[PDB]
Amino acid sequence: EEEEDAGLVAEAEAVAAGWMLDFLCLSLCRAFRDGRSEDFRRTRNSAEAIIHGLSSLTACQLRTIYICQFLTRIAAGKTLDAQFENDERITPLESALMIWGSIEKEHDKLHEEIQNLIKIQAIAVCMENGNFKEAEEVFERIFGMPFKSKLLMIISQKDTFHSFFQHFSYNHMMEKIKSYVNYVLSEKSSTFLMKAAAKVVESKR
Amino acid sequence: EEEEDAGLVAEAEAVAAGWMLDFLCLSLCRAFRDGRSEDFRRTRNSAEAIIHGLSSLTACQLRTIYICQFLTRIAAGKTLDAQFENDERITPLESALMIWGSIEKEHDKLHEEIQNLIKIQAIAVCMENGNFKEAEEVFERIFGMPFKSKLLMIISQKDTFHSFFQHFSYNHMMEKIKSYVNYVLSEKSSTFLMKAAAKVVESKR
């Protein structure tokens, strides 16, 4: 039974890849929370490679991949040269906003706060780079009244260092996202590979 | 104790990366043995990324990385445009020969047979591409008397489709290497991640 052996082997590889995806998501969340930039970069490279070796995904695995993709776009939020979508006009924070609205998760107060902070910063990052026409195009793509009209007024005046962007800042967006990442870390700390590795480390204490 | 928690977490990540390296080596060996080219390519991408996230290696982990690197160079043996070493003159089969001589393994009859087949084919692949001067430079770097002088005679005559290369062929080299890969597969089939995944698959039968 050479085909039966091959089949059972491929099924075991799929189980192992699932365990590796959860572990890499947990590690990526932790590097983002701790601000360990180089660990985040190396872990993201590993997460992408493992994802390309996975074919069929459960709803839980799709949510895990979206969390990885969301943090990657957020970490690249100021890198306006990075192209995350087939449509080259979409900026990194706009790509993060699309993923945020697709994740099967509760739309609690924190969800809406992170959503609105990414919207403000998607415009703010264009303004800070002197890309005023791009800021207006990002505004049109996002918006699709009171906050909307304040944003359009800021874009038209080219008021880059406007106090509005200091109130709803890039740092405030990152802090709110780190609060959400803390919840993902708590949830995934019990996944198979991390639990088994932690038990090994503890047994040697 | 924020530093103690961080420390135990990094140690658990190192244990998990070790388990992932063994599993990826096993999967890479199997794709090479089965001739599953695309699975080999995707698995190699995952193996490289995991290796860059590992710092301190045990002697066993270094041997595992060398096995991965050796199969990658062998799979690229006919790709003379590929540069595996800082010295751009070194061809892929020459790079595989260097690794073969560095692995902490028994120098049994099969070891020497694979070694000599890689030496012949490192010259053969240059000849087949019409790279006669490169074949002579590869010969000088490798050699570093009876087989040595037959090889130099073949290079000087530009006898690409010589019967000697059909007797000690690229296919014969691949078959001997697959015999060695079967031994590595038997040895690594008992490593943690594959054993646990296989037990999950079996429990669902």
Ligand SMILES: NS(=O)(=O)c1ccccc1OC(F)F
């Ligand atoms: N390509 S990407 O930068 O959006 C990315 C980042 C982390 C994990 C996966 C991933 O892509 C895809 F592999 F899931």
Ligand SMILES: NS(=O)(=O)c1ccccc1OC(F)F
């Ligand atoms: N760079 S490479 O093509 O020699 C290679 C292939 C498989 C695994 C690791 C690896 O390099 C290094 F990551 F170990």
Ligand SMILES: [Ca+2]
């Ligand atoms: Ca751009």
Ligand SMILES: [Ca+2]
């Ligand atoms: Ca070359």
